[PDB]
Structures are given as C-alpha cells and as structure tokens.
Design a protein around this ligand. Sequence first.
Ligand SMILES: O[C@@H]1[C@@H](O)[C@H](O[C@@H]2CO[C@@H](O)[C@H](O)[C@H]2O)OC[C@H]1O
Ligand SMILES: *[C@@H]1O[C@H](CO)[C@@H](O)[C@H](O)[C@H]1NC(C)=O
Length: 319
Amino acid sequence: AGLNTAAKAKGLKYFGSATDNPELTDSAYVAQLSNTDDFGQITPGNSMKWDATEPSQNSFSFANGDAVVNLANKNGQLMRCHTLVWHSQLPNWVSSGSWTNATLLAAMKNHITNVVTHYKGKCYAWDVVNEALNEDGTFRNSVFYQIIGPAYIPIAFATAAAADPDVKLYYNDYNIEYSGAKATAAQNIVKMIKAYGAKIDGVGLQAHFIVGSTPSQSDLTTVLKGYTALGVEVAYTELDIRMQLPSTAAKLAQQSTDFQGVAAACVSTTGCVGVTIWDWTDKYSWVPSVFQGYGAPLPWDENYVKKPAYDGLMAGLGA
Ligand SMILES: O[C@@H]1[C@@H](O)[C@H](O[C@@H]2CO[C@@H](O)[C@H](O)[C@H]2O)OC[C@H]1O
Ligand SMILES: *[C@@H]1O[C@H](CO)[C@@H](O)[C@H](O)[C@H]1NC(C)=O
C-alpha cells in the first residue's frame, strides 16, 4: 500500500518523514504526513534542538517538541528524536559563554539529562551527537570539541544512556554514506565510544544527496555493512536528493533511480532499520534556502503529488 508498508514487509522497522511545527497547520499536509501506509515514523526538524529546548541555561522549553510527539502518538507513528549535541542551532548562552571544561561539561550533561528524561519512553532513537567530523575525518572544531576535547562524545552518550537506558543512541552525520575518510572516521567514533565504556546503538546516515551524483547502491551497501559489522544498527535519517534546477523529466527520472538505490541498499543490509526522508514534499524542503539553484528533492512535489522518485523508492523496497 505505501512506503512504510513496503518497508516493513522487507523487515525494516519503518519508513518515515521529518516535519516542522509550522507545517502542522496545513490540513492537506497533515493528512498525508498522517498516512501510515507511507509514514510509520516522524522526526522533528527543529523543535528538539538545543536552541528550542534550552533557550536559557537551566530553562527548558518543550511545547514545540511535544506537539510533534503528540502528532506521532495520535497516528501510532514512532519518533526519532533529534538532536542533543550539535554545533548548529545553539542558543547564545552556549556560543558566547566563557567556559572551562568543567562548566561546559556540566551545562552539556544537564541539557542531555533534562531533554532525554523529558522524552523518556517516547523515542525509538536519539541522534545524541550530530556532525562531529570534518570532511577529512578530523574532529569538527565546535565549542564542545575546543573546550572538552574528544571525550565530549562518549560522555554525551553515557549521559543519555543514564537518563533513558532503552532508547537507541545514534551518532548522526552527512558524507558518511560513501567510502572515504569521513565514513572511516564515523566507524572510529563508534569504536571510541565503546572503548570509553559508553553505549552506542546506531549510526545515522543523513543522506543529503544530489541527483545524478548519488552514491551507488554497491558503495552505499559496503558502507552500511562497514557499520553493522561493528555491532550497531544503521538508518538513513534525512534522505533527500536535490536536483540542479530547473526540474525536467530526465532529472526526475534520474532522481527516481537515485532514491531506488538508497532503499535497496538498506533492504540489502540486515541491521538497516529504516529510512526517514527530510520532509516529504518539495514545498517544505529546506534545500532551496541553503543550496542556491537546487531544489525539488523529495518524492512528492510542491502540490503534494507523487513524483517518479516515489515509484523509485517502492521499487527499491521490492514493492
Ligand atoms: O549544515 C549542514 C550542511 O552543511 C550539510 O551539507 C552537505 C554538504 O556536503 C554535501 O555533499 C551534502 O550533500 C550536504 O548535505 O548538510 C547537513 C547540514 O546540517
Ligand atoms: C574534561 O573533563 C573530562 C573528565 O571529566 C575529561 O574526560 C576530558 O579530557 C577533559 N578535557 C579537557 C580538554 O580538559
């Protein structure tokens, strides 16, 4: 019947979508987001981030986060919860602080504990640390890395696990889906967390790809199995395949095969629990405001009509 039914028929836990609170007032949007044939899982695109949930130190704010959880709960959809520690979308107080390791650690741990405890039992997974790597595999020079060093990462995992020992804890990043230094460095994060003694359950592969320049099914698969070999699960967490505009029939058809390989790479890897697309309609994609001249990235168009990429996805899922 749809993406999520197809996914689950192959053994995946879900096919799902991100959304954002402003979109939840659009009734046609909400009807299709709530269609469990297509979507068994939801991620908040913004309202679980640090700026949203801890706008002043020790002053937490959950209304926007909880409204997306309430929508998933209404529909019987799973949640992925995103994200506890990331260099982007920090409030002023974190980025302007004069910190020591001790003071930043305490603020970081308190942020994780509060937000994880709040959502205890409500999330299938947390993206505990997002985008910790540079493209060469070195560590990104965030405030956390500068002040705390590499240990920020396992400490973040340990703190999340203490607060909610049942939820799957993921490391999430982009450009870790194809073979190369960054992917290798992502395997090394997995290793490092466990060497610390901290828990990590999964690797999140963002999968912000480009039409006609998408990793091949064989390399995607090699890379997924490179993670599952380590004793973790994997998921594609923010899949979108942006095209250089203008849209054409030929680019739509390439987009289909590109999405098809992603689905099929996940099916072919035991331990790939699911795919989430980064929203589901071109109308609300984040792409055009970030990647100038690119757009039309998703399986439905801006009028909420299925594109050929929907059929590519179904085909990759063996449906
Ligand atoms: O802010 C982050 C973006 O920088 C990131 O951009 C990536 C650049 O490399 C490209 O090949 C990837 O496709 C593209 O996503 O995406 C995630 C975002 O948070
Ligand atoms: C910060 O403190 C923790 C111990 O709590 C330690 O693991 C880490 O190396 C420290 N980092 C720095 C840069 O001093």
